[PDB]
Curated annotation (Swiss-Prot), chain B:
<feature type="disulfide bond">
    <location>
        <begin position="32"/>
        <end position="41"/>
    </location>
</feature>
<feature type="glycosylation site" description="N-linked (GlcNAc...) (complex) asparagine; by host">
    <location>
        <position position="27"/>
    </location>
</feature>
<feature type="glycosylation site" description="N-linked (GlcNAc...) (high mannose) asparagine; by host">
    <location>
        <position position="66"/>
    </location>
</feature>
<feature type="glycosylation site" description="N-linked (GlcNAc...) (hybrid) asparagine; by host">
    <location>
        <position position="74"/>
    </location>
</feature>
<comment type="similarity">
    <text>Belongs to the betacoronaviruses spike protein family.</text>
</comment>
<protein>
    <recommendedName>
        <fullName>Spike glycoprotein</fullName>
    </recommendedName>
</protein>
<feature type="glycosylation site" description="O-linked (GlcNAc...) threonine; by host GALNT1">
    <location>
        <position position="46"/>
    </location>
</feature>
């Protein structure tokens, strides 16, 4: 599930008028357009910070798994953080950041820049490890009050009771159940690495934002009925009396290009916000408890879930 | 505009978001007050503006054991509001 | 019962104070008011822009100019102002969509939290949901969620099963606990120990498959009264 998109900032004066001081005087008498565009884009940028905070800051403490990793036969090694790697990401997490991925310097010179997120990748990985450690040592109790420890095999006996299977079935098949879970976890790593389009829902988020910016840059070579598409050429070739009817077309034309981009950006943020709202609900109900809703947390009878962090999104293992 | 920051003796700090002038960088950690960016926040604290790295939360460690459980002996009725 | 009625009433008494003292508790609803007024001020204030014309007043343009040169000057004004109204209506459609989504969530919470009891985690409050109460606010609604939160936990030693007579017994609706000397069976969410009998436990299998079984005695209610 995607959770956020790139936060962009646009310099209204520089994009429209470039380095012309003559255009800057004339842009003042066109109203408060650049004030509106900044206000709209700032609202999108702040909302992106809230989406990540809403989804990942579900817990108020930072839990840790005990030094000995033995939970009744279940491995969990592929999801717990890796101390050897400096990034402190799990093997599945490190694999995800590779799957999802001058032009930047050219865009910066037109007034298009990108603000960095408030929560770095290190902070978001710590939320996922705190959530993962809580749900292993406690169950669903850390999501409704103080975290009360319980042995993992006894926790799984509770989770079978929630789907209509009695406790004895787990205890008399504990070794079989552990091996099936370990094998299923291992196959998830291999199947994910081989396919490059598996992480396609977040590449589209990255592609659309970069593609829309490129079209905005290429819009600067249009003429809009003017003699030329260069502000300096028009001002160095015609008298100020008659140059006004030419510069007006370019200023209005480039104002339309800026307004269109913001309108499309506002619509996309609405879609992303809906996706982030769903991701936050799934964390509350699949990860912090056991869900009885059909096909909400995976296909089958839900037992538990584990979150992983990914660039601009989240991945649930149901 | 004509205004200038001293840039010297004003505790210039270097962040991934940019250059922050006029705030001292402490080594403590507090809850975020004013977001600067890339994990840096700012707040007004004792007669100065300080910049720090925001803390996710209080550290905790559930005492996981092999045959140990924890059961409550009391409860509380809590009323919260949603707007 | 008497203690529970007291805790509820103290919780209610703090809500009257919490909203009154905190200034930004109703920030979500005040945002609806502010965005509407700010849009209308911008629409009104945008009437002074010349949009490249000589002035922003239509009457002055017509009185000081000949008709064929007046139409050129006012065309910029009419086109400029038509653009302002189109942008204003477009923003309204986007805002109305966001409000409708919040209205749909409020209608759902009313049906589920207020008209019933919800098992979904964190949907109705932080904790185990009990019931909810609605209150009407300007351009919105306010829910008071009543939740049950455990407190004052204790350490215990636990076992998955109890072995007796070569048969494995599992709890029916509780968990086996021990304070150090004796073994009890208690409900999970509250400490209420009881003697392990054949009424609150069921037998399944023998005493070697389960990893972690414990020898104890499972009291039989039928036997002692029969001997009387
Ligand atoms: C949990 O699974 C991982 C891999 O899924 C196991 O790591 C393997 O360990 C063996 C022996 O140390 C190595 O030969 C393999 O190369 C390791 N695999 C990887 C991918 O590094 C790990 O042993 C499992 N945990 C336990 C307790 O057995
Ligand atoms: C239940 O038992 C565990 C096992 O000792 C307790 O865990 C330790 O408690 C002491 C008491 O102050 C702490 O200093 C240690 O840091 C705890 N260990 C860990 C790994 O966190 C636990 O405290 C006991 N339960 C309660 C409510 O005290
Ligand atoms: C559970 O908590 C309640 C209060 O939270 C305890 O009730 C207290 O009882 C003592 C004496 O019986 C008195 O101070 C009051 O009646 C209660 N306190 C308050 C502040 O009202 C109750 O005893 C606790 N139960 C257990 C088993 O610890
Ligand atoms: C564990 O619980 C049992 C049952 O409550 C305790 O046994 C009682 O201990 C008290 C202490 O004086 C005696 O008065 C009772 O006669 C005991 N019950 C019976 C049936 O003999 C036991 O003491 C508890 N363990 C600990 C360490 O306190
Ligand atoms: C207490 O923990 C130890 C290890 O920390 C558990 O010992 C393992 O038990 C399984 C179950 O038969 C064996 O397959 C392993 O060979 C044992 N050793 C290890 C290193 O895993 C022990 O089972 C735990 N106690 C309980 C009651 O579960
Ligand atoms: C629980 O009871 C069983 C009896 O069914 C015990 O098993 C016996 O253990 C002794 C050793 O102490 C052996 O010599 C016997 O042959 C075992 N079988 C029988 C039928 O007595 C078992 O040891 C008990 N649990 C514990 C922890 O001692």
């Amino acid at each position: 599930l995607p959770v956020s998109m790139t936060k962009t900032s646009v310099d209204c004066t520089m994009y429209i008028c470039g380095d012309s001081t003559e255009c800057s005087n004339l842009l003042l008498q066109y109203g408060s357009f650049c004030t509106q565009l900044k206000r709209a884009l700032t609202g999108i940028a702040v909302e992106q910070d809230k989406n990540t905070q809403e989804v990942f800051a579900q817990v108020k403490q930072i839990y840790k798994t005990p030094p000995i990793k033995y939970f009744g036969g279940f491995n969990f090694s592929q999801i717990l953080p890796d101390p050897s790697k400096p990034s402190k990401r799990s093997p599945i997490e490190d694999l995800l950041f590779n799957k999802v991925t001058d032009l930047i310097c050219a865009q910066k010179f037109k007034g298009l820049t990108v603000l960095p997120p408030l929560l770095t990748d290190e902070m978001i990985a710590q939320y996922t490890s705190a959530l993962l450690a809580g749900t292993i040592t406690s169950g669903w109790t850390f999501g409704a009050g103080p975290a009360l420890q319980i042995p993992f095999p006894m926790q799984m006996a509770y989770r079978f009771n929630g789907i209509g299977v009695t406790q004895n079935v787990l205890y008399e098949n504990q070794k079989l159940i552990a091996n099936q879970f370990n094998s299923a976890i291992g196959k998830i790593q291999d199947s994910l690495s081989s396919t490059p389009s598996a992480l396609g829902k977040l590449q589209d988020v990255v592609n659309h934002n970069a593609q829309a910016l490129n079209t905005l840059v290429k819009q600067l070579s249009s003429k809009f009925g003017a003699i030329s598409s260069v502000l300096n050429d028009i001002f160095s070739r015609l008298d100020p009396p008659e140059a006004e009817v030419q510069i007006d077309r370019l200023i209005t034309g480039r104002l339309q290009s800026l307004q269109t981009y913001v309108t499309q950006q506002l619509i996309r943020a609405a879609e992303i916000r809906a996706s982030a709202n769903l991701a936050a609900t799934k964390m509350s109900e699949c990860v912090l408890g056991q869900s009885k809703r059909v096909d909400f947390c995976g296909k089958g009878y839900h037992l538990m879930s584990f979150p992983q962090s990914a660039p601009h999104g989240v991945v649930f293992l149901h | 505009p004509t205004w200038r920051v001293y840039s010297t003796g004003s505790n210039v700090f270097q962040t991934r978001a940019g250059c922050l002038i006029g705030a001292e960088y402490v080594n403590n950690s507090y809850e975020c007050d004013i977001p600067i960016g890339a994990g840096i926040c700012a707040s007004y604290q004792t007669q100065s503006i300080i910049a720090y790295t925001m803390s996710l939360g209080a550290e905790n460690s559930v005492a996981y054991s092999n045959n140990s459980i924890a059961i409550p002996t009391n409860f509380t009725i809590s009323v919260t509001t949603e707007i | 019962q008497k203690l529970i009625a007291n805790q509820f009433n103290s919780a209610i008494g703090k809500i009257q104070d919490s909203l009154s003292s905190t200034p930004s508790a109703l920030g979500k609803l005040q945002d609806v008011v502010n965005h509407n007024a700010q849009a209308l001020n911008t629409l009104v204030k945008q009437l002074s822009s010349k949009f490249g014309a000589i002035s922003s007043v239509l009457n002055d343009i017509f009185s000081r100019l000949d008709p064929p040169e007046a139409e050129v000057q006012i065309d910029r004004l009419i086109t400029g102002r038509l653009q302002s109204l189109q942008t204003y209506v477009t923003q309204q459609l986007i805002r109305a969509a966001e409000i409708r989504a919040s209205a749909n969530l409020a209608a759902t919470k009313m049906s589920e939290c207020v008209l019933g009891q919800s098992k979904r985690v964190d949907f109705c409050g932080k904790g185990y949901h009990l019931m909810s109460f609605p209150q009407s606010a300007p351009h919105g609604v306010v829910f008071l969620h009543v939740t049950y939160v455990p407190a004052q936990e204790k350490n215990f030693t636990t076992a998955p099963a109890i072995c007796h007579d070569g048969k494995a017994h599992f709890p029916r609706e509780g968990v086996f606990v021990s304070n150090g000397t004796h073994w009890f069976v208690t409900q999970r969410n509250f400490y209420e120990p009881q003697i392990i009998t054949t009424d609150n436990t069921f037998v399944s299998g023998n005493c070697d498959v389960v990893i972690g079984i414990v020898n104890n005695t499972v009291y039989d209610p039928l036997q002692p009264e029969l001997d009387s």
